[PDB]
Design a protein around this ligand. Structure first.
Ligand SMILES: [Zn+2]
Ligand SMILES: [Zn+2]
Ligand SMILES: [Zn+2]
Ligand SMILES: [Zn+2]
Ligand SMILES: [Zn+2]
Ligand SMILES: [Zn+2]
Lengths: 97, 97
């Protein structure tokens, strides 16, 4: 059936391909942007509609069921983490630059 | 970790407690209502904001990873179904009235 990596990929930011973690915002048509890309943009990167601040509460609840890969996976980190632990892990991760 | 019934419950309509299936709409603040309850309402049953028609595309994608219980589970149906098969199953289900 369904897998954790299948669910996690639904949170990928279409701009940086890191993960969109709570709080999760979206445009009128349902496109996501992460917290870090959002301030560098004047509109939705997918549809060019306004970014806005519609709240995707349901996706935040899904996120409590997903283990998200460390942002340093491409440097060789194999740890996957609940979203509440991801930031603290990445700050001390063996594979950070 | 996470379970299928945990994910499925995130789709429960807060009005009838059946499941909100694609296409999934939501209010400004992220509350869901199913296709059948929506026309019987003049505003979001959770926050009383406008119902609107913001599209929760991400939840629709999650839904492709979830097996949803037959609406006649409380009559004793134990079948759980991909959302694309749920309606046809319920039309012939052993446990319909
Ligand atoms: Zn991003
Ligand atoms: Zn958009
Ligand atoms: Zn790491
Ligand atoms: Zn309903
Ligand atoms: Zn609402
Ligand atoms: Zn059934």
């Amino acid at each position: 059936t369904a897998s954790n990596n299948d669910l996690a990929s639904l949170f990928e930011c279409p701009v940086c391909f890191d993960y969109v973690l709570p709080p999760i915002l979206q445009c009128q048509s349902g496109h996501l942007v992460c917290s870090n890309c959002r301030p560098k943009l004047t509109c939705c990167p997918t549809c060019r509609g306004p970014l806005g601040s519609i709240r995707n509460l349901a996706m935040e609840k899904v996120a409590n069921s997903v283990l998200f890969p460390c942002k340093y996976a491409s440097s060789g980190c194999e740890i996957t983490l609940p979203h509440t632990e991801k930031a603290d892990h990445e700050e001390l991760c063996e594979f950070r630059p």
